[PDB]
Amino acid sequence: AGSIPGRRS
Amino acid sequence: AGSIPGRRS
Amino acid sequence: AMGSMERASLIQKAKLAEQAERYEDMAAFMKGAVEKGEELSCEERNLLSVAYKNVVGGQRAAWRVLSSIEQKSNGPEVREYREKVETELQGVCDTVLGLLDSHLIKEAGDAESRVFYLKMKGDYYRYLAEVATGDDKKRIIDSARSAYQEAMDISKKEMPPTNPIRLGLALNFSVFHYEIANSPEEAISLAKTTFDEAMADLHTLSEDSYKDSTLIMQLLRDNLTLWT
Amino acid sequence: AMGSMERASLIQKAKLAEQAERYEDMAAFMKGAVEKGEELSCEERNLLSVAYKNVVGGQRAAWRVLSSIEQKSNGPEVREYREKVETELQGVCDTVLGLLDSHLIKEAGDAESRVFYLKMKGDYYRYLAEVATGDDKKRIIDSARSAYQEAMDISKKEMPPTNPIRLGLALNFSVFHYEIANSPEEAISLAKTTFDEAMADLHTLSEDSYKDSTLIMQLLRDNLTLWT
Numbered sequence: 001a002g003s004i005p006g007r008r009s
Numbered sequence: 010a011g012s013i014p015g016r017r018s
Numbered sequence: 019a020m021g022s023m024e025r026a027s028l029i030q031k032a033k034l035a036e037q038a039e040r041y042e043d044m045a046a047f048m049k050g051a052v053e054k055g056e057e058l059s060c061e062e063r064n065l066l067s068v069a070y071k072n073v074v075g076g077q078r079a080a081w082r083v084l085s086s087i088e089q090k091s092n093g094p095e096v097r098e099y100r101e102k103v104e105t106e107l108q109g110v111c112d113t114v115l116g117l118l119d120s121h122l123i124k125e126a127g128d129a130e131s132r133v134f135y136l137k138m139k140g141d142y143y144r145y146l147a148e149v150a151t152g153d154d155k156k157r158i159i160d161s162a163r164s165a166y167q168e169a170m171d172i173s174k175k176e177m178p179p180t181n182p183i184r185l186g187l188a189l190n191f192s193v194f195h196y197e198i199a200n201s202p203e204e205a206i207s208l209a210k211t212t213f214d215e216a217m218a219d220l221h222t223l224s225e226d227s228y229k230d231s232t233l234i235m236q237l238l239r240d241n242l243t244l245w246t
Numbered sequence: 247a248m249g250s251m252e253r254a255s256l257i258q259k260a261k262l263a264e265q266a267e268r269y270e271d272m273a274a275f276m277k278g279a280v281e282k283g284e285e286l287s288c289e290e291r292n293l294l295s296v297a298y299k300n301v302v303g304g305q306r307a308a309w310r311v312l313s314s315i316e317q318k319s320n321g322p323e324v325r326e327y328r329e330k331v332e333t334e335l336q337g338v339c340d341t342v343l344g345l346l347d348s349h350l351i352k353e354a355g356d357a358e359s360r361v362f363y364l365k366m367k368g369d370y371y372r373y374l375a376e377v378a379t380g381d382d383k384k385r386i387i388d389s390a391r392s393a394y395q396e397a398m399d400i401s402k403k404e405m406p407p408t409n410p411i412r413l414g415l416a417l418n419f420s421v422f423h424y425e426i427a428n429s430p431e432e433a434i435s436l437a438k439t440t441f442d443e444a445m446a447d448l449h450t451l452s453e454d455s456y457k458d459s460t461l462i463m464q465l466l467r468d469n470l471t472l473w474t
């Protein structure tokens with residue numbers, strides 16, 4: 001399912 | 010303001 | 019770099035790239051298709067326009083973010099990076115303009131193709147004008163104006179007032195007047211006259227054409243609401 | 247191509263590129279910063295990871311769209327274009343892996359940096375595994391597993407069970423088990439044990455650390471809900 005979205009910051 | 014979005018199709 | 023790929027394969031890959039939201043690839047595939055030298059069908063013209071509109075739309079959004087930061091700050095980094103983005107945006111606009119000039123417009127004899135390409139020419143000069151300064155800005159503004167005006171003159175003679183290309187041309191020329199040419203009253207007059215003339219022609223349309231035309235008319239009304 | 251730009255200017259431009267949503271530029275700026283040869287601070291590690299996660303995230307989404315079309319169809323165009331996207335994705339993963347191997351991991355001695363980089367190594371092998379087939383897939387899967395396992399072993403010895411890097415490592419290793427390694431029971435056990443051990447340590451945290459840890463715990467619970 002979801003990994004760390006990790007696309008902000 | 011808004012021009013034709015024109016980004017689909 | 020697309021010279022070795024079949025025209026039909028470039029078109030098919032442009033459609034796949036649109037589905038994959040790979041707009042840079044889509045624009046490169048459609049540039050390759052244009053450079054095959056044949057005229058573009060209606061669907062192919064739309065693929066060319068959608069591809070470049072998405073590429074330059076991303077660049078314009080980034081340029082606006084960076085310009086806003088740069089203006090708040092007034093080291094060289096924000097200006098340098100805004101300049102890099104600006105140059106890349108200018109290059110995409112010059113590429114599109116070059117396709118139109120070599121040789122899409124000169125081979126376009128039907129009103130729907132010629133108006134479509136001249137509207138694109140106005141749009142890409144308009145995006146150049148958005149980032150231009152001073153006494154380059156003037157000539158770029160005039161080039162946009164001249165392209166939109168030729169398209170308007172053809173569209174009024176050759177297409178009904180509900181034709182979606184005619185409507186979108188008028189919408190975008192009105193945005194040119196309001197945002198670029200400092201002519202808000204001309205923008206409002208054009209949007210109002212376009213809307214009213216389309217309204218009066220809706221009775222001639224099928225259900226599906228009515229949906230197409232009213233969608234763009236709503237955009238004209240949304241701008242008029244914002245401008246008045 | 248960033249060798250002539252100051253490290254501090256690359257970092258500043260990576261932050262501007264993030265604000266402008268220009269993730270390819272952001273990744274190139276952070277690659278240039280890594281190649282200056284100094285270790286990365288905590289904030290700089292996060293900029294490196296965010297940049298590449300966005301680049302490879304776009305590629306993975308496009309690859310999934312194209313693979314789905316290709317599987318529905320089973321001319322060469324969909325396969326050829328899926329292969330092009332796949333090669334570009336593999337190249338980005340190889341670039342990130344190369345930065346980690348030359349020389350970020352070997353210079354990382356503190357647990358927070360070493361776990362961070364080994365989690366990245368597991369993640370980028372995992373993205374390679376998503377597109378791999380057969381008896382290359384096996385070695386790539388093992389490389390992901392080995393990187394995640396080393397990170398897990400350090401994190402359990404050196405960080406509290408609420409540390410966000412420890413939590414995100416465990417989340418992503420559980421996704422590895424479920425989606426790549428065909429070990430759904432190991433995925434569920436790891437997510438449950440991680441969640442429970444973090445819950446028991448929340449009482450030690452400040453308000454802001456509590457918010458950080460509970461955010462990731464919610465992701466563990468969301469996966470557990472989907473998997474059970």
Ligand SMILES: *Cc1ccc([N+](=O)[O-])c(OS(=O)(=O)c2cnn(C)c2)c1
Pocket residue numbers: 004005006007008009291292293295296365410411413414415458
């Ligand atoms: C893998 C990972 C887990 C947690 C965090 N973090 O919450 O700091 C990471 O740092 S990050 O910059 O990549 C990130 C991801 N999501 N946020 C809010 C930050 C990485």
Ligand SMILES: *Cc1ccc([N+](=O)[O-])c(OS(=O)(=O)c2cnn(C)c2)c1
Pocket residue numbers: 013014015016017018063064065067068137182183185186187230
């Ligand atoms: C400028 C323009 C106006 C209308 C249309 N159209 O409705 O067909 C255009 O074609 S398009 O492919 O660029 C487009 C834009 N929005 N849609 C739904 C299609 C162009």
Ligand SMILES: [Ca+2]
Pocket residue numbers: 024025
């Ligand atoms: Ca041919």
Ligand SMILES: [Ca+2]
Pocket residue numbers: 252253
């Ligand atoms: Ca220096």
Ligand SMILES: [Cl-]
Pocket residue numbers: 057125126127128
């Ligand atoms: Cl012709």
Ligand SMILES: [Cl-]
Pocket residue numbers: 285353354355356
């Ligand atoms: Cl060190």
